[PDB]
Amino acid sequence: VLAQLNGDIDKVNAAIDGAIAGIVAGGLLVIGGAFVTAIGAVASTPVVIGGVAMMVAGAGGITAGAIVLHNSLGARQDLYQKRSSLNSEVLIATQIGN
Amino acid sequence: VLAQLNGDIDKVNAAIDGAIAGIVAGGLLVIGGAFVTAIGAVADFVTAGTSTPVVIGGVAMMVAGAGGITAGAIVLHNSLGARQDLYQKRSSLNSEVLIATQIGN
Amino acid sequence: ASQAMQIQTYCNSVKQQVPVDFSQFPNLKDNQTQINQGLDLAKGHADLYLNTIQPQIITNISNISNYFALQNAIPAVLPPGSTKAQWLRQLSVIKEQATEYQRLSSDTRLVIVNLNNNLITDSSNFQGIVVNLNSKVQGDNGVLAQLNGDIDKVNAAIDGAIAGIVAGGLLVIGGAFVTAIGAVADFVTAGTSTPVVIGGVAMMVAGAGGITAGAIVLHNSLGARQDLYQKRSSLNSEVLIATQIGNGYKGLQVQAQNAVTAATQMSNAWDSLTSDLGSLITDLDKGITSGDDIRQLWLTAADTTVKTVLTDVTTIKAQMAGVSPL
Amino acid sequence: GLDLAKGHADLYLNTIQPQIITNISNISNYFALQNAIPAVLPPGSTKAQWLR
Amino acid sequence: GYKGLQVQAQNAVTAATQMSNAWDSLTSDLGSLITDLDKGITSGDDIRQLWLTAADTTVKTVLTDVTTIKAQMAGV
Amino acid sequence: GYKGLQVQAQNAVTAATQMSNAWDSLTSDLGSLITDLDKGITSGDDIRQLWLTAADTTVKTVLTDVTTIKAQMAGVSPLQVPQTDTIANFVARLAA
DSSP: OHHHHHHHHHHHHHHHHHHHHHHHHHHHHHHHHHHHHHHHTOOOOHHHHHHHHHHHHHHHHHHHHHHHHHHHHHHHHHHHHHHHHHHHHHHHHHHHHO | OHHHHHHHHHHHHHHHHHHHHHHHHHHHHHHHHHHHHHHHHHTTTTSTTTTHHHHHHHHHHHHHHHHHHHHHHHHHHHHHHHHHHHHHHHHHHHHHHHHHHHHHO | OOHHHHHHHHHHHHHTOOOOOOTTOGGGHHHHHHHHHHHHHHHHHHHHIIIIIHHHHHHHHHHHHHHHHHSOOOOOSOOTTOOHHHHHHHHHHHHHHHHHHHHHHHHHHHHHHHHHHHHHHHHHHHHHHHHHHHHHHHHHHHHHHHHHHHHHHHHHHHHHHHHHHHHHHHHHHHHHHHHHHHHHHHHHSTTTTHHHHHHHHHHHHHHHHHHHHHHHHHHHHHHHHHHHHHHHHHHHHHHHHHHHHHHHHHHHHHHHHHHHHHHHHHHHHHHHHHHHHHHHHHHHHHHHTOOSHHHHHHHHHHHHHHHHHHHHHHHHHHHTOOOOOO | OHHHHHHHHHHIIIIIHHHHHHHHHHHHHHHHHHHHHHHHSOTTOOHHHHHO | OHHHHHHHHHHHHHHHHHHHHHHHHHHHHHHHHHHHHHTTSSOHHHHHHHHHHHHHTHHHHHHHHHHHHHHHHHTO | OHHHHHHHHHHHHHHHHHHHHHHHHHHHHHHHHHHHHHHHHTTOHHHHHHHHHHHHHHHHHHHHHHHHHHHHTOOOOOOOOOOOOOHHHHHHHHHO
8 A cells, every 4th residue: 555655646636736827827817917917007908908817817827826736735635644644653553573 | 832833844845935936937938938928929920019018928928937937936934934933943842842741750 | 791881881871961052043943952961961860870879878788798708697596705794785786787788778768769760850851852853854854845846836937037048049040030031131122021030139129138038037036046045945944953852862762761770670689689678677576585396597697687788788789780882 | 831741751760660679679688588598407497486 | 182181181080089099198198197197096916917917918909000001101 | 905904004004003902901900010129128017918919919910911912923924815807717717
């Protein structure tokens, strides 16, 4: 079971990674849209419209990423703890066994 | 207590991993954005003022990216310290719990 | 190696240790206080064994040993010379010698109580010093392992930036050239080679673009990585030095455990002497206050018991023999 | 809890162990007395003083 | 190296102190013996045995320990 | 090689320090014989005998000191063969 869990934990680290990328992608789109907006506020408004579309999307990915992250961290911590429990069980049975 | 500490380590490490991600993606957008900006600025004195949409999107990238590099630094200075606090606190706790069990044994 | 050489060995080892300075390692502020406090205490305990306790035990056994080396027998039948009034005085003397020698033994054992407790506290202090250091070390390896992955991920950014700079120069050298063909063809026949000049400069501007940007990004990516592996080689130092110090204190705790066993074994030897003298005192008492065959029975036993005292005395003397080497 | 444990350990080491070593001393003395009888009671000795 | 050598020096003070004191205990005991003798608490004949028992036991340890120490220091 | 040489030098130093100690004992004990012989000479009868008797004991101690030094200083050291490196091992130590 331990060796299988180790792959499982590896596998799930992709979700945590993916959600971090998401958030930063989000954050980037906001820095960008924020800049494109102040731009349009000079000149005329067609671009300001993109700007907010960009910041809205940005925040979407941050809000979605954040939820995807909470979940994926939780499902991982459940695996860690199951693992550490076995690890401790192998350790005890081995010591007692010897 | 153990799950709370484990959860904060998860958060502090996710915060740092994303800080890095910013620095990485950031630099890409900077470089990316400079290629795009050059292409637009030249296709701007070719097409009289047609392609200002792309010069803008180019500069916007570099700005994003740069903010992504500048942010990922703030966060990597204000996290490295807090991560060593949390691990030391966690190892402390494991040790002390074991000592409690040993006393019982 | 005798029981006293065991304890000496610990004493000479502990006395030579040096207070640790962890001032370059804020994570270890507390491990420093605990160590230097533990050590100062152990140093006092070690001095007192060498200055006081060992001398007292040895002195005490010397007195006891001198007396019973002479009085190595109990006259259990009235001896050819004496009368009965002065037989019963001879015996009453010895009874009182051994009553006095009994309390001294008991008071030697109570000193050994203090010594056992002193070694045990030291052994304990060192157990805890080792445990806390291991905590800290285990903490740090958690971090080191995260710092590692963290460094690998930044090496991406640096590789990217280098890739960007090299693609930059290539775009410039190649762009320059295409611009030169385009530009020289328009000069000979204006108009004909317009998308070439245009593409040439696109590439040229883009290139110096990537070069300038790439180098910025590289300067930051190197800075960021350098902070990371200097934080990393501080932990490696912190681990190494917590480990050396720690393995020193594992050693000191084993030297002190050994001494505990030795001092316990002294406790045991003195307990027997005390108890064997008890029997002597009993045998002489009943001996004195009894009649005929009865008197003799007790006094024979007392004699048998004196040989046992002598046994016990050689035991302690073996225990306190010697001057441990370096 | 620990302090009360070390209290129990201390009672063993400083009250019971010495009582056990004392018991052994008492074995030594008891056999000193047992082996002393033939010494005090030569061959032509009576049941009465064997009993005494 | 510097710290360890101040610690080594400190040890040398503590042991010098204990040795100075040992000489003191000797000179004082020898003085009491002199007083006592001078006021008839004991006789040279008393002293004579106490000094004879000493040499065969307690002094033979000091004298033993001397050639043991000279040995250690000489590597023999 | 220079590691092995510094070890040999550190043993040499220990042996030379231990020489120093034994010569210091001979020195100090002879100071004691001198002290006894003097006080004995300039003294008379029972006190003479006292000093002189110690002097005797000391002279016994002095021979100890001498037999100890003589022990440090006897012997001719045998040849030491350091097994050194061959070609097949050196060519092999490059390949790794």
